[PDB]
A paper describes a structure:
We adopted the Z domain of staphylococcal protein A and its affibody binder dimer complex as a model system. We next generated libraries at the interface of a weakly associating dimer (Z+ ZSPA-1) with micromolar affinity to determine if we could affinity-mature the interface by coevolution. To clarify these inter-residue co-variations discovered from the sequence data, we determined crystal structures of 10 coevolved pairs that spanned a range of cross-reactivities and orthogonalities (5 from LL1 and 5 from LL2). From the structures, we could verify clear compensatory changes between the residues showing the most significant covariations (13A-9B / 17A-31B) in both LL1 and LL2 library mutants.
First, the binding preferences of the two highest affinity pairs from the LL1 library, LL1.c1 (LIFFK/FILF) and LL1.c2 (LILFK/FIVM), are nearly completely orthogonal, so we focused on investigating specificity-determining positions of the two variants. The two mutants differ by only three amino acid positions (positions 17A, 31B, and 32B) but have virtually no cross-reactivity with each other. Z-A sequences of LL1.c1 and LL1.c2 bind to their own Z-B sequence 500-fold stronger than when mixed with the other’s Z-B sequence. Thus, the mutant LL1.c6 (LILFK/FIVF) can be a “bridging” intermediate to help explain the structural evolution of orthogonality through cross-reactivity. Comparing structures of LL1.c2 and LL1.c6 revealed that the single mutation Met32BPhe in LL1.c6 induced a noticeable geometric change by forming an enhanced hydrophobic cluster within the binding interface (Leu9A, Leu13A, Lys35A, Phe5B, Phe32B, and Trp35B). Due to the rotation of Trp35B and Trp35B-centered hydrophobic packing induced by Phe32B, the N-terminal end of helix 1 and C-terminal end of helix 2 of Z-A tilted 17° closer to Z-B. Furthermore, the compensatory relationship between position 17A and position 31B is clearly revealed from the structures of LL1.c1 and LL1.c2. Taken together, the synergistic effects of the geometric change and compensatory mutations found from these three specificity-determining positions resulted in biased specificities of the two high-affinity variants evolved from the same library. We also followed a single mutational three-step evolutionary trajectory from LILFK/FIVM to LIFFK/FILF which are the two high affinity orthogonal pairs from LL1 library showing similar thermodynamic trends. For example, A-LILFK has more Z-B binding partners (B=77) than A-LIFFK (B=15) from the LL1 library, and A-LVLF (B=53) and A-VFLV (B=42) are also more cross-reactive than A-IVFF (B=3) from LL2 library sequence data.
Author numbering:
A (entry chain A): 2 to 57
B (entry chain B): 3 to 58
C-alpha cells in the first residue's frame, strides 16, 4: 500500500512549512524521519503540537 | 554539525518560488530529500520552471 510513502512525503513537506520551528528543531525532525520513516505521522503530530505551542 | 543543512536550505528555497504549483514543489522537495547533493541542479531547474510559469 501507498500509505507509507504518502505519509512520509506529507510529514516532510509540512514540517518544512511549520513557521514556529527553529532550524535545529526542524533538522531534528528531518533526521528522525530518515531514521524511522514508519513514525512519520507521529513525528508530524509532535512537530505540529510543538509548532503550535511555540506560536507568537 | 547538521546532516540535513543542504536539504533544509534548498527545500526552503523551493517552496518560496511563487509560480510553482503544489505538485511541482512537492516533487522537487522529494528529489532533494532523496538526493541532497543535487541541490544546486534541482534549484536551478525549479527556478527555470518558476520563471517560465510567470505571467511574463
Amino acid at each position: 500500500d501507498n500509505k507509507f510513502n504518502k505519509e512520509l512525503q506529507n510529514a516532510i513537506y509540512e514540517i518544512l512549512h511549520l513557521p514556529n520551528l527553529n532550524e535545529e528543531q526542524r533538522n531534528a525532525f528531518f533526521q528522525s524521519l530518515k531514521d524511522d520513516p514508519s513514525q512519520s505521522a507521529n513525528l508530524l503530530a509532535e512537530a505540529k503540537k510543538l509548532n503550535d505551542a511555540q506560536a507568537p
